């Protein structure tokens, strides 16, 4: 029993469900920030670590490419 | 959170091309013209397209 | 009395002679197949020549078919006139308490639900032939409910195999086989249908969450003796276990508001749960023995109140 | 002799059920306390159908009525679903005297709505054989103001409980022609026999074209064996929910899951194998074979419903005897079978996946 | 007809309380009988059992509620051969479910929440009159629980009568309902595999477009070493042909309420039929 299943203990007794919601933030999560070209604000892209989609560590080939 | 989750089940069963996930800020809807007060009144639609490079075509 | 009871008139004709007419006496605790609700029926409307379809006389197992468009009824006194029964689907007695009769070699005990079978064993096929009117009455078995999902289970996957042993029981420790005989090919495709529609009904979305468990009962079969008491030694999921390691999907459609689990056990129930009442038909009887004993011996009446 | 039946008294309102236009004798049909309806809409829909709708379409009937399980009669039943019955010329007969006899203020107003209401019964998938409940048939009633006390047989025979006016006691089994759906003369059955009376419900499930349909069958088959009765009749409704029932749930494009490989993998000595310690270890459960089963989108049985009946009750005549006349429900001719001689039974529902 | 459970001697004064306080209660007795003891009905009778035992048992057994209790025996009738002679028999919620009119009642054992006799040396426990709709939701919510421990907030929360159950209010319940959960999951793989190695198609198959032309082909009347397969057929038949009896929690008891109010609430009692 790693650390990790032990924090799925702790919010499975205190909240009393599972919430996938809240299955992927004990989890690794990449927070990128990035900016706007149309209207200079921030905006913040997001991979995970269960995620098919891009920057998750369980993804599809082929993979994205800044070859252009 | 449940709005990420409800997209990349459209994405696994493929509806070749990739996913990225974005967080838009407050001010960024701000500048581009939308009222904030107006998406208060929990998923909601929204129709997004692709378009080419100097084609036209788009999906 | 309309409510409680329900007195159907099985008329016995005129010609009939006494080697004839002192083997309907015997018959006094038995299960008669009515096709309807009359009450005044003749002997010719029980026996086994209303029985055959256009020109075929059918097997044991299109014998089951036609019992569940029938009505069970139970004899309650051979008068020299007339056959007096009692439809179960109706209702009992005022008192609600008709005695039945074994011809199982069976023994029955209390709370028992009663499912009754065709004569389909061997030593059992016996069958009260009236010579002077040509009339065989095949009367069913009451068997217990547990032998009653074995032996439609025996008959139906027997038929799937010449699609293309078995036969002997064991109940109590006590050895019996049931007849083996070719099957009419009509009755066999009626049965594999109602199998496999209740048995993809039952499959939902949420039971590949159900499946990833599997190398969970193997790995527990080791440690628990009532799990490794439980699988079986010619078992399918422990070939299962050793082989294909099965994994869930990881997201849900709308997999927020529904519940995955609920709604694969809730279809499980009401089609996989709901089988043994699709291939044969219902047990509406169970025995309540009341002080004489509580297990009644082969070929001994038993009191009966009714069933759910 | 005097047979032996059970009554039920309860404190109903006259919002749906009218128990001085609809008389005495006809069917009622009680509800579950409507605060359960919008959670359990939330909790057993299909994914990508519309949770919030039951809870919005029962919303604009309380909100149409003002202008507490309470109780639908058969006659405001019928004339809801009117809109999806062959005999259309008696259909509009139903609905002629709902919305003209019933106590209120634009009663046609209910009939569009609650009709509405389960439109959103069958696409929300709280189907209302799960909600609908017998109740008994009417025997007598009190009248008072925005309510009434309703008398009715939860279990017997109609024809012995007493009315109370002593110039008329008795009541029968009062029903709209348009429900009522013989089995003895559409299949040829002439012969005589008790015979058993059904409470039907069909159902439609297409994209905001749905419907309802609430029949009372008169038939010779027990309930073990009415299915393929059924399908014979409402074979139609089964195929248009078979193709049409799963909508705006996602598919897997193309299939992703290949043929299942046990009877090729058993057969070979040289597949590896492990033992029960073994599994459940990442080391050896990796060298197995890897399975990854998708049941997404499947038509399932649920979703694939298209009628639920339950017993209602029985006929014990050798004959059954059925009638058809035209009473008169105040200033309207309506199409009428009368029964004759029904003894209550209630039993489960069962749908017809 | 009614039954007359004689109290064996030696009762001390809270004892009589407490036998007092059980008038509307469901009793199960083994046969129908006159003279019946006490240490028949008691939970030493069922030696302990858990729930896939206790529903086992309540099916070969023959329920009875309570009628008058006299000080020196409980007159009980059965729900089967002496309800349909009588009336009406009162029947007292141990529930925190309000019945209402009309319900069909079956019966489950108590998960939810024990009349002890000292002086006697038994305990008593005794069945739940809930409504059978409930009855199917209420053991498949928590057998879906315990597959989940080898959850979500919103399968403990259940509406019934405008009114909010918590199945949580956890620890003993799951090793109590081991059994069940044991033997629930086992007749599904076995299930779905033999299906799967009959027509082993059935998931490669495109969903709405291959599946279903499949299925309506099985829908319709007009069409017409060695795995241990069909030796596991009849395996599966006889085992999850058990589960539909035991998990059917068929109903003995309806509630036609007449001069009362048409909700029950805890606490109460409600008048009880069983016949037309």
Redesign the interface.
Same mark, same amino acid.
């Given at each position: 029993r790693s650390l990790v299943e032990w924090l799925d203990r702790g919010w499975?007794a205190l909240?009393?469900?599972? !919430?996938?919601?809240?299955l992927? *933030?004990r989890r690794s999560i990449s927070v990128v920030l990035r900016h706007?070209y149309?209207?200079?604000? !921030?905006?913040?892209?997001? *991979?995970?670590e269960? *995620?098919?989609?891009?920057?998750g560590r369980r993804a599809r080939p082929? @993979? @994205?490419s800044s070859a252009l | 959170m449940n709005a990420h989750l409800a997209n990349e089940v459209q994405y696994d069963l493929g509806h070749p091309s990739s996913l990225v996930h974005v967080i838009i800020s407050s001010e960024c809807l701000a500048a581009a013209g939308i009222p904030l007060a107006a998406l208060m009144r929990a998923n909601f639609q929204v129709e997004i397209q692709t378009r080419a490079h100097a084609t036209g075509d788009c999906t | 009395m309309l409510a409680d009871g329900f007195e159907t008139d099985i008329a016995i004709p005129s010609g009939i002679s006494r080697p004839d007419a002192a083997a309907l006496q015997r018959c006094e605790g038995r299960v008669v197949f009515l096709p309807t609700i009359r009450r005044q029926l003749t002997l010719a409307d029980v026996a086994h020549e209303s029985f055959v379809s256009g020109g075929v006389s059918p097997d044991t197992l299109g014998l089951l078919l036609a019992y569940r468009r029938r009505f069970p009824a139970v004899i309650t006194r051979v008068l020299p006139t007339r056959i007096v029964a009692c439809p179960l689907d109706v209702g009992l007695t005022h008192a609600g308490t008709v005695n039945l009769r074994n011809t199982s070699p069976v023994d029955l005990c209390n709370g028992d639900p009663i499912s009754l079978v065709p004569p389909v064993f061997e030593g059992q096929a016996t069958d009260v032939r009236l010579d002077s009117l040509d009339l065989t009455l095949r009367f069913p078995v009451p068997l217990p409910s547990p032998l009653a999902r074995e032996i439609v289970a025996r008959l139906v996957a027997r038929g799937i195999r010449d699609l293309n042993d078995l036969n002997v029981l064991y109940y109590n420790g006590s050895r019996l086989s049931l007849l083996a005989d070719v099957q009419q090919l009509g009755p066999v495709n009626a049965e594999l249908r109602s199998l496999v529609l209740n048995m993809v009904y039952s499959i939902t979305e949420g039971t590949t969450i159900i499946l990833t468990l599997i190398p969970r009962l193997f790995a527990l079969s080791a440690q628990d003796g009532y799990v490794n008491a439980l699988l079986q030694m010619q078992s399918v999921t422990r070939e299962a276990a050793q082989l294909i390691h099965p994994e869930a999907p990881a997201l849900m459609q709308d997999g927020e508001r529904r519940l995955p689990l609920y709604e694969a056990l809730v279809a499980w129930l009401t089609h996989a749960g709901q089988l043994g009442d699709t291939l044969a038909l219902a047990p509406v009887v169970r025995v309540c023995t009341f002080d004489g004993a509580a297990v009644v011996r082969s070929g001994d009446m038993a009191p009966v109140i009714r069933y759910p | 002799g005097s047979p032996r039946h059970h009554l039920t008294r309860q404190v109903i309102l006259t919002d749906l059920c009218q128990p001085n236009a609809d008389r005495a004798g006809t069917l009622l049909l009680a509800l579950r306390h409507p605060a359960d309806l919008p959670h359990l809409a939330h909790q057993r829909a299909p994914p990508g159908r519309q949770t919030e709708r039951l809870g919005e379409a029962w919303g604009q009937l309380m909100e149409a009525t003002a202008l507490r399980a309470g109780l639908v009669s058969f006659n405001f039943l019928v004339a809801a679903c009117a809109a999806s019955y062959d005999a259309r010329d008696a259909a509009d007969a139903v609905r002629a005297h709902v919305t003209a006899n019933y106590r209120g203020t634009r009663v046609g107003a209910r009939l569009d709505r609650f009709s509405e209401c389960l439109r959103a019964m069958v696409h929300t998938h709280v189907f209302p054989h799960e909600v609908m409940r017998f109740f008994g048939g009417l025997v007598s009633w009190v009248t008072q103001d925005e309510l009434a006390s309703v008398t009715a047989v939860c279990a017997g025979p109609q024809e012995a409980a007493h009315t109370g006016h002593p110039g008329r006691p008795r009541s029968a089994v009062i029903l709209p022609a348009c429900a009522f759906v013989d089995l003895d003369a559409e299949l040829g059955l002439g012969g005589p026999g008790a015979a058993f009376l059904y409470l039907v419900f069909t159902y439609r499930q297409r994209r905001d074209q749905e419907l309802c349909c609430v029949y009372v069958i008169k038939s010779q088959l027990p309930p073990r064996g009415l299915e393929p009765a059924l399908e014979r009749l409402f074979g139609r409704l089964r195929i248009t929910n078979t193709i049409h029932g799963t909508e705006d749930m996602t598919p897997p494009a193309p299939n992703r899951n290949p043929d299942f490989p046990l009877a090729g993998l058993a057969a070979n000595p040289q597949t590896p194998r492990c033992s029960a310690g073994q599994v459940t270890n990442p080391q050896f459960a990796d060298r197995l074979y890897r399975w990854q089963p998708d049941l997404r989108g499947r038509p399932t049985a649920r979703t694939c419903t298209y009628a639920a009946f339950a017993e209602l009750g029985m006929m014990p005549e050798d004959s059954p005897r059925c009638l058809h006349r035209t009473e008169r429900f105040g200033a309207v001719s309506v199409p009428v079978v009368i029964l004759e001689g029904v003894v209550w039974r209630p039993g489960e529902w069962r749908a017809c996946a």
């Amino acid at each position: 029993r790693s650390l990790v299943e032990w924090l799925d203990r702790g919010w499975e007794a205190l909240a009393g469900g599972d !919430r996938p919601d809240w299955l992927w *933030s004990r989890r690794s999560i990449s927070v990128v920030l990035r900016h706007h070209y149309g209207t200079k604000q !921030r905006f913040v892209v997001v *991979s995970y670590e269960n *995620s098919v989609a891009w920057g998750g560590r369980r993804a599809r080939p082929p @993979l @994205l490419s800044s070859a252009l | 959170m449940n709005a990420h989750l409800a997209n990349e089940v459209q994405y696994d069963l493929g509806h070749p091309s990739s996913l990225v996930h974005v967080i838009i800020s407050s001010e960024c809807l701000a500048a581009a013209g939308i009222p904030l007060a107006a998406l208060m009144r929990a998923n909601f639609q929204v129709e997004i397209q692709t378009r080419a490079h100097a084609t036209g075509d788009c999906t | 009395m309309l409510a409680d009871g329900f007195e159907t008139d099985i008329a016995i004709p005129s010609g009939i002679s006494r080697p004839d007419a002192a083997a309907l006496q015997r018959c006094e605790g038995r299960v008669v197949f009515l096709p309807t609700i009359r009450r005044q029926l003749t002997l010719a409307d029980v026996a086994h020549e209303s029985f055959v379809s256009g020109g075929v006389s059918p097997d044991t197992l299109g014998l089951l078919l036609a019992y569940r468009r029938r009505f069970p009824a139970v004899i309650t006194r051979v008068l020299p006139t007339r056959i007096v029964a009692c439809p179960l689907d109706v209702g009992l007695t005022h008192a609600g308490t008709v005695n039945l009769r074994n011809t199982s070699p069976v023994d029955l005990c209390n709370g028992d639900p009663i499912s009754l079978v065709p004569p389909v064993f061997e030593g059992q096929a016996t069958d009260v032939r009236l010579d002077s009117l040509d009339l065989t009455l095949r009367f069913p078995v009451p068997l217990p409910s547990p032998l009653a999902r074995e032996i439609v289970a025996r008959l139906v996957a027997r038929g799937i195999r010449d699609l293309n042993d078995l036969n002997v029981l064991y109940y109590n420790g006590s050895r019996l086989s049931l007849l083996a005989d070719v099957q009419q090919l009509g009755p066999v495709n009626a049965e594999l249908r109602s199998l496999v529609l209740n048995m993809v009904y039952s499959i939902t979305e949420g039971t590949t969450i159900i499946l990833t468990l599997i190398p969970r009962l193997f790995a527990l079969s080791a440690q628990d003796g009532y799990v490794n008491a439980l699988l079986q030694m010619q078992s399918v999921t422990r070939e299962a276990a050793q082989l294909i390691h099965p994994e869930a999907p990881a997201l849900m459609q709308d997999g927020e508001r529904r519940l995955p689990l609920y709604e694969a056990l809730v279809a499980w129930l009401t089609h996989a749960g709901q089988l043994g009442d699709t291939l044969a038909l219902a047990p509406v009887v169970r025995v309540c023995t009341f002080d004489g004993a509580a297990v009644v011996r082969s070929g001994d009446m038993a009191p009966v109140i009714r069933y759910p | 002799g005097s047979p032996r039946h059970h009554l039920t008294r309860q404190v109903i309102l006259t919002d749906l059920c009218q128990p001085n236009a609809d008389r005495a004798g006809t069917l009622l049909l009680a509800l579950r306390h409507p605060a359960d309806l919008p959670h359990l809409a939330h909790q057993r829909a299909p994914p990508g159908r519309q949770t919030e709708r039951l809870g919005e379409a029962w919303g604009q009937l309380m909100e149409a009525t003002a202008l507490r399980a309470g109780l639908v009669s058969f006659n405001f039943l019928v004339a809801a679903c009117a809109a999806s019955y062959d005999a259309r010329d008696a259909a509009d007969a139903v609905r002629a005297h709902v919305t003209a006899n019933y106590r209120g203020t634009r009663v046609g107003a209910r009939l569009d709505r609650f009709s509405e209401c389960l439109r959103a019964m069958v696409h929300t998938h709280v189907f209302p054989h799960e909600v609908m409940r017998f109740f008994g048939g009417l025997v007598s009633w009190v009248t008072q103001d925005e309510l009434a006390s309703v008398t009715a047989v939860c279990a017997g025979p109609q024809e012995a409980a007493h009315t109370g006016h002593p110039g008329r006691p008795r009541s029968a089994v009062i029903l709209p022609a348009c429900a009522f759906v013989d089995l003895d003369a559409e299949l040829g059955l002439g012969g005589p026999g008790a015979a058993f009376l059904y409470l039907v419900f069909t159902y439609r499930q297409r994209r905001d074209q749905e419907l309802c349909c609430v029949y009372v069958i008169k038939s010779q088959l027990p309930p073990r064996g009415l299915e393929p009765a059924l399908e014979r009749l409402f074979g139609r409704l089964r195929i248009t929910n078979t193709i049409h029932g799963t909508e705006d749930m996602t598919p897997p494009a193309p299939n992703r899951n290949p043929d299942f490989p046990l009877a090729g993998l058993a057969a070979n000595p040289q597949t590896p194998r492990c033992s029960a310690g073994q599994v459940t270890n990442p080391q050896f459960a990796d060298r197995l074979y890897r399975w990854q089963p998708d049941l997404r989108g499947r038509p399932t049985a649920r979703t694939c419903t298209y009628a639920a009946f339950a017993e209602l009750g029985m006929m014990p005549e050798d004959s059954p005897r059925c009638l058809h006349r035209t009473e008169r429900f105040g200033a309207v001719s309506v199409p009428v079978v009368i029964l004759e001689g029904v003894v209550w039974r209630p039993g489960e529902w069962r749908a017809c996946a």
